[PDB]
Design an enzyme around this catalytic site. Structure first.
Site, PDB file in Angstrom:
ATOM      1  N   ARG A  45     -50.530 -13.022  51.849  1.00  0.00           N
ATOM      2  CA  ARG A  45     -49.616 -13.367  52.865  1.00  0.00           C
ATOM      3  C   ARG A  45     -50.200 -14.390  53.804  1.00  0.00           C
ATOM      4  NH1 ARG A  45     -45.431  -9.414  52.753  1.00  0.00           N
ATOM      5  NH2 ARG A  45     -46.015  -7.664  51.711  1.00  0.00           N
ATOM      6  N   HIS A  53     -45.705 -20.151  49.682  1.00  0.00           N
ATOM      7  CA  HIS A  53     -45.358 -19.460  48.503  1.00  0.00           C
ATOM      8  C   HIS A  53     -45.868 -20.143  47.264  1.00  0.00           C
ATOM      9  CE1 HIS A  53     -42.737 -17.619  51.438  1.00  0.00           C
ATOM     10  NE2 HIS A  53     -42.822 -16.516  50.798  1.00  0.00           N
ATOM     11  N   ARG A  74     -49.035 -19.017  45.552  1.00  0.00           N
ATOM     12  CA  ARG A  74     -48.832 -17.687  45.121  1.00  0.00           C
ATOM     13  C   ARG A  74     -48.079 -17.621  43.818  1.00  0.00           C
ATOM     14  NH1 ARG A  74     -46.439 -12.398  48.275  1.00  0.00           N
ATOM     15  NH2 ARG A  74     -47.404 -10.935  47.085  1.00  0.00           N
ATOM     16  N   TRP A 119     -48.385  -4.314  44.454  1.00  0.00           N
ATOM     17  CA  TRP A 119     -47.060  -4.702  44.172  1.00  0.00           C
ATOM     18  C   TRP A 119     -46.241  -3.592  43.579  1.00  0.00           C
ATOM     19  CZ3 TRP A 119     -46.405 -10.510  42.858  1.00  0.00           C
ATOM     20  CH2 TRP A 119     -45.279 -10.967  43.386  1.00  0.00           C
ATOM     21  N   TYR A 145     -40.623 -14.857  37.472  1.00  0.00           N
ATOM     22  CA  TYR A 145     -41.760 -15.650  37.202  1.00  0.00           C
ATOM     23  C   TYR A 145     -41.954 -15.821  35.720  1.00  0.00           C
ATOM     24  CZ  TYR A 145     -42.612 -13.979  41.980  1.00  0.00           C
ATOM     25  OH  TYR A 145     -42.523 -13.531  43.257  1.00  0.00           O
TER      26      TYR A 145
END
Lengths: 315, 300
Positions: A154, A261, A264, A287, A296
């Site tokens: 984050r 993002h 990531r 997660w 993804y």
DNA sequence: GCCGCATAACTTCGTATAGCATACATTATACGAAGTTATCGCCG
DNA sequence: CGGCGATAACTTCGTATAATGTATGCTATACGAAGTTATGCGGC
């Protein structure tokens, strides 16, 4: 304004406090409604389901994302509940409108948008380019990018990181613990961050944050408190995108450039293409089992279909 | 019954859209409820939460699956909603009972049961057995099964398939585009099987016409320009072949005593899982969203 | 050595949009059965 | 001789049980913009 200000202060006198985002957004909504309702010369505070419906259809003529409208409705029901008014707005008109505009927008076939990935090849390219840089800002920025592409934290949490968090060990490997998880930094990037730390002299106190303001003089100044300049880090991503590419496109679209993002995303896709064990990935990501991951994965070439071969083969 | 017909037609007033399955099940729930409620000599149309409690207690005494009892509850909510009555059966009692009976049912420790698997090995065996067969209906069935195990779909999806769907290409490979959609490929030996079926049957000269059409006890086939909804009959094929490899079913009457429409798909899935490869792209090819169900096909 | 005032880095605001855990709403399956159909059996 | 008997090979139906989907209450974010600071770059 003063009407909504007073009403929100009367609510705050209940001593419930939302997230800052929450309360912000709520007040914004209150402004929007009161302004439109006054424009229609209707009582701003007491709602009417046909007036609300008219507002909603006005918004639909505005062409807003349905989710937004839905969010508005949520805000309104929230206000009812916490005001003690009927939490549901009258569902028949409301739900019929919702169903109509939902289906009508779904018929447009529009998509929930996805931030562009930042590739490992781009990372290697920018490393090759900036590694030549004498500018301490460039050293700091490349170090930050290496940290990001390892840790995939984050952005607010990497902004949170404080030198008392950090340790390093044999080979120069570096470890950082945060609420409680410790992540490891591989040797070469431990050396890069050492270069940053030593050259800047930043955060000699372990209370102090690893990245600190650098003036146009090229002079770092440490801070004992977080700079919070996440918008500035986003500006870094913009600048680097504007280096590997030109300026943003004139479409005014989002995701025209890399974003926090994007790294990531990129590393997630890289792991997916590496095919490393899934539960390993999900544990490392802390997660929930999430088809987001598979969205993804969705964007990958693996469609080998070997079973036709194995059926024909194997004999 | 006619009373129930009148009642349900009345509530069917204020008509609104359903799947045929949904309307059927709704009507069956209404049958059960109306019969029970009349037996109890209670007002059939309006609900009462203590009546719902007593009904649920009776359903628990029948030992029905909690999922189905819950489903009945759902249906009741539905009918309230769509008739314009309050959706929630009074939640605190309703919810408390729900929770309690949920716990009591989970205390049974029951398993999600799984269909009988089918293997490549089984395929090889049945093929070795039946390859001698001259009966074109047997060739039909075998061709069907070899496609199914190549493609591993809904039974409905394979039912839809129309000769216009089908093409063949280099090496004699055959490709079929299905759904909105996906094109899938047929492995050579089963291509030869299906070609034997097609050429011997002469079925579906118009590509409008479906690949599989009725057979007659004469040893004759009649093509169809329309879907015959064979699928239940296809299940009968699966049962017949099960009763070839084995005797009759056991008298236990349980499900999954034999191969089901799941059986081929689940089978090949476990086969690939034992091959231990391509997890995401094979899940894609089978179209599953990632789910523990997949794992419990894979788990063993 | 003061006035002018710049580029730059940064703060704040607006608004349009994206995440997500959970209860319970919608669709499908598995199965036993009744009912079909038209084709051949075949009496004497 | 050709009727009904019987069948294959099929269809419609009723039962009970699952798989599949989503929206709700609360959170945070992407991109433009005005506005802010500041000290150092420029002149005489």
């Amino acid at each position: 304004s003063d009407e909504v200000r007073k009403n929100l202060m009367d609510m705050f006198r209940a001593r419930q406090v939302f997230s800052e985002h929450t309360w912000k957004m709520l007040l914004s909504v209150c402004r929007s409604w009161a302004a439109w309702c006054k424009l229609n010369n209707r009582k701003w505070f007491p709602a009417e389901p046909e007036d609300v419906r008219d507002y909603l259809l006005y918004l639909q003529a505005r062409g807003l994302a349905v989710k937004t409208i839905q969010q508005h409705l949520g805000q309104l029901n929230m206000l009812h509940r916490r005001s003690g008014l009927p939490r549901p707005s009258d569902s028949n008109a409301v739900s019929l409108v919702m169903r109509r505009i939902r289906k009508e927008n779904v018929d447009a076939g529009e998509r929930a948008k996805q931030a562009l990935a930042f590739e490992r090849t781009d990372f290697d390219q920018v490393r090759s380019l900036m590694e030549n840089s004498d500018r301490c800002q460039d050293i700091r920025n490349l170090a930050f990018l290496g940290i990001a592409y390892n840790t995939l934290l984050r952005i607010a949490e990497i902004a949170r990181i404080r030198v008392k968090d950090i340790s390093r060990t044999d080979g120069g490997a570096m470890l950082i613990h945060i609420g409680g998880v410790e992540k490891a930094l591989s040797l070469g990037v431990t050396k890069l961050v050492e270069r940053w730390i030593s050259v800047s002299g930043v955060a000699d106190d372990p209370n102090n944050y690893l990245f600190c303001r650098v003036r146009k003089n090229g002079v770092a100044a440490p801070s004992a408190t977080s700079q919070l300049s996440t918008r500035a880090l986003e500006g870094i991503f913009e600048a680097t995108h504007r280096l590997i590419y030109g300026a943003k496109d004139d479409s005014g679209q989002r995701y025209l450039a890399w974003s926090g993002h994007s790294a990531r995303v990129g590393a997630a896709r890289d792991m997916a293409r590496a095919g490393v064990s899934i539960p390993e990935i999900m544990q490392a990501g802390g997660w929930t089992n999430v088809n987001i991951v598979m969205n993804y994965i969705r964007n990958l070439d693996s469609e080998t279909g070997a079973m036709v071969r194995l059926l024909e083969d194997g004999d």
